[PDB]
């Protein structure tokens, strides 16, 4: 029965996605901000994908890190094959959707993962930040303001719904994101930005004492 296998795989995955920490990504004046609840110091849920494309995930670490690696592979092979400015967040999101659909239908167990691909404009350029959310089945959704992944997404999504403000500075967006995430110190937070002002590589982690000052 295709219906029972579809429904059951869906439940399996959605469970393991709610069975994990929470990540948020939101647009602010200087680009995009990733704020994840992460206790470990070695295992990370936020990553650079390409010059202006960042990546956050929530679920089973070995699998979304498998996807992290695959995406890095893809982006670099394209950038070298054509050029750096040809790789876009949109292509990456689409590849993740195809791959999560194929995994969801063909592999034994579906990837209990939820992805968010983020993109900002190039240096000295003007364009709105783009957020995409890719779910375990292959579905892809275009988000204008913020993405919330993993755990219980309702209270965080609503708190962000009340607190969000376009063109908020880095500190305000950090306060809003940590507040809505609580609905945690520098020893339990993974914070990075897609700073639109950097010349080439936009991704930049905010850790330690600098993070301490910001929050």
């Amino acid at each position: 029965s295709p219906e029972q296998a579809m429904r059951e795989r869906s439940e399996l995955a959605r469970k393991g996605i709610a069975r994990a920490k929470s990540v948020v990504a939101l647009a602010y004046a200087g680009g995009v901000l990733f704020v994840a609840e992460n206790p470990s110091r070695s295992l990370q849920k936020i990553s650079e994908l390409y010059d202006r494309v960042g990546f956050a995930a929530a679920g089973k670490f070995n699998e979304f890190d498998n996807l992290r690696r695959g995406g890095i592979q893809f982006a670099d092979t394209r950038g070298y094959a054509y050029d750096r400015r040809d790789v876009t967040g949109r292509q990456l999101a689409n590849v993740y959707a195809q791959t999560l659909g194929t995994i969801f239908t063909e592999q034994a167990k579906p990837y209990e993962v939820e992805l968010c691909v983020a993109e900002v404009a190039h240096y000295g350029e003007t364009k709105r930040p783009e957020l995409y959310r890719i779910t375990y089945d292959g579905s892809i959704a275009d988000e204008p303001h913020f993405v919330v992944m993993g755990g219980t997404t309702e209270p965080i999504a609503n708190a962000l719904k009340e607190s969000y403000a376009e063109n908020a500075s880095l500190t305000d967006a950090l306060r809003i994101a940590v507040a809505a995430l609580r609905a945690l110190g520098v020893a339990s937070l993974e914070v990075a930005v897609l700073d639109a002002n950097r010349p080439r590589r936009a991704f930049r982690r905010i850790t330690g004492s600098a993070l301490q000052a910001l929050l």
Partner: peptide, 5 residues
């Protein structure tokens, strides 16, 4: 499943 257009 998903990705319906």
């Amino acid at each position: 499943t998903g990705q319906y257009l």
